[PDB]
C-alpha cells in the first residue's frame, strides 16, 4: 500500500541534526512520507554556537497546519513547542485529523539541570498533549517535571514517574535514561499501564549526540505508522537511534550530530528487553 504520511510539528534546527531536520531524515530512512509544520527557526552564532530562536508568525503556522490537515497525516509527532498557544494547537490538529498515532516528545529547556525554564509550557503539555498521546517520550528531567517527582536517579524512580504520567492520560510512556541516568549501559523504561519493560543497549560515545532525542521520537512515530505496536516501536526506535549515536560525528568544537542513516547504512544495534 501507499507510504504512510507522517507529520512533525517542530522548528528548524539550522545545524540539521535535531528539530524537523532529524524528523524528516528519520521518516525518510523508515520509508514513510515525511511532512513538517514549522514553528520557528533556530540559528547558531558562528563563534560561540549560542542559539537564537526566531518564531514564525502564527498566521503562517496555522496555514501550514491547514495544508497538513487537509493532506491527512496517518501519524503526528510533536517536537519542541515553545508556547502555550502552539502546544494547544498541536493537540487540536491531532484531534481534528484521522491520525491514529500521536507521539509527544515533551521537550523542556533547563535554567540549571534541576530547574525548568518556562514552567507554563509543562502545564500546557499536561493539560493538552498528555491526554491525547499514544506515546510520550520524556527524558529524565522532563519525566520528573511531568510527574511532579523532581529528580529521578534510578529505574525505580522511572517506574514511579511512568505510573504517574500514564495516570495523567498518556497511553504509553517511555522514560529515557540514556546519558542522564549515567550508568554502564543505556537504559530506557517503557510502560503500557500494566507492565514495565527496561530497554537496554550499550552506552556509546556521548560527545556527538545532537538530535538523539528528536530522532528517537521520530523513529517511534514512523514505526507506529508502519504497523508496529507501541512496545515494538520503542524497541525498534531505540535500536535505530543507538546506531545513529554510535556513529555520531564532530561538526565543530560545540556540537556533533547523530548519523540518522546509520541504522540502514552502517549497522544494526541490539536492544535487550526485560520486565522490571
Ligand X SMILES: Nc1ncnc2c1ncn2[C@@H]1O[C@H](COP(=O)(O)OP(=O)(O)O)[C@@H](O)[C@H]1O
The count of residues interacting with a second copy (CB under 8 A) is: 44
Which residue in 173, 171, 169, 122 sits closest to 161, CA to CA? 173
Site string for ligand X, 162-201 (x = CB under 6 A): --------------xxxxx-----x-x------------x
Bridge-based pairing of strands 185-191 and 172-176 is antiparallel
Q: What are phi and psi of 255, to 5 degrees?
A: -160, 155
Residue 244 CA to residue 18 CA, distance in Å, equals: 12
Place of cell 503556522: 61
**CA distances in angstroms from 37 to 31, 77, 94, listed in the order given:** 19, 10, 12
C-alpha cell at 185: 549501559
- Residue of 241, 256, 262, 263 interacting with ligand X (CB under 6 A): 241
Whole-number minimum distance, CB 28 to a second copy, in Å? 5
Task: Give least dist CB 79 to a second copy, A.
Answer: 15
Evaluated on CA atoms 70, 75, 81, 87, the torsion sign reads positive
Q: Of the listed pieces 61-69, 95-103, 121-129, 173-181, which binds a second copy according to CB under 8 A? A: 61-69
* Min CB(97)–ligand X separation in Å: 25
Q: Which does residue 45 bind out of a second copy, ligand X, none, counting CB within 5 to 8 angstroms by kind?
A: a second copy
Please provide the size of the chain in residues.
276
What angle (nearest 5°) sits at the alpha carbon of residue 132, between those of residues 199 and 101? 65
Chain residues binding ligand X by CB under 6 A are 139, 176-180, 186, 188, 201, 203-204, 206, 209, 212-213, 216, 238, 241-242, 245
Q: Which residues bind a second copy (CB under 8 A)?
A: 2-3, 12, 14-16, 21, 24-25, 28-29, 31, 33-38, 41, 43-46, 52, 54, 56-57, 60, 63-64, 66-71, 249, 251-252, 257, 259-261, 265
Amino acid at each position: 500500500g501507499a507510504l504512510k504520511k507522517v507529520l512533525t510539528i517542530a522548528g528548524s534546527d539550522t545545524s540539521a541534526g535535531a528539530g524537523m531536520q532529524a524528523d524528516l531524515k528519520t521518516f525518510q530512512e523508515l520509508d514513510t512520507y515525511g511532512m513538517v509544520a514549522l514553528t520557528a527557526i533556530v540559528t547558531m552564532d558562528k563563534d560561540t554556537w549560542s542559539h537564537d530562536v526566531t518564531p514564525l508568525p502564527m498566521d503562517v503556522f496555522e496555514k501550514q497546519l491547514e495544508t497538513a490537515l487537509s493532506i491527512g497525516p496517518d501519524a503526528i509527532k510533536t517536537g519542541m513547542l515553545g508556547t502555550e498557544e502552539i502546544i494547544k494547537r498541536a493537540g487540536e490538529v491531532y484531534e481534528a485529523s484521522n491520525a491514529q498515532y500521536f507521539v509527544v516528545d515533551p521537550v523542556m529547556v533547563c535554567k540549571g539541570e534541576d530547574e525548568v525554564l518556562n514552567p507554563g509550557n509543562t502545564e500546557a503539555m499536561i493539560k493538552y498533549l498528555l491526554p491525547k498521546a499514544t506515546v510520550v517520550t520524556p527524558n529524565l528531567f522532563e519525566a520528573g517535571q511531568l510527574s511532579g517527582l523532581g529528580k529521578l536517579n534510578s529505574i525505580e524512580d522511572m517506574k514511579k514517574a511512568a505510573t504517574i504520567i500514564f495516570d495523567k492520560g498518556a497511553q504509553h510512556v517511555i522514560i529515557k535514561g540514556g546519558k542522564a541516568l549515567d550508568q554502564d549501559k543505556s537504559y530506557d523504561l517503557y510502560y503500557d499501564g500494566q507492565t514495565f519493560y527496561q530497554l537496554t543497549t550499550d552506552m556509546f560515545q556521548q560527545s556527538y549526540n545532537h538530535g538523539a532525542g528528536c530522532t528517537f521520537a521520530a523513529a517511534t512515530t514512523a514505526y507506529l505508522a508502519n504497523g508496529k505496536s507501541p512496545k515494538e516501536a520503542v524497541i525498534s526506535a531505540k535500536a535505530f537511534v543507538a546506531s545513529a549515536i554510535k556513529n555520531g560525528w564532530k561538526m565543530n568544537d560545540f556540537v556533533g550530530p547523530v548519523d540518522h542513516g546509520a541504522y540502514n547504512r552502517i549497522e544494526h544495534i541490539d536492544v535487550e528487553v526485560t520486565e522490571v
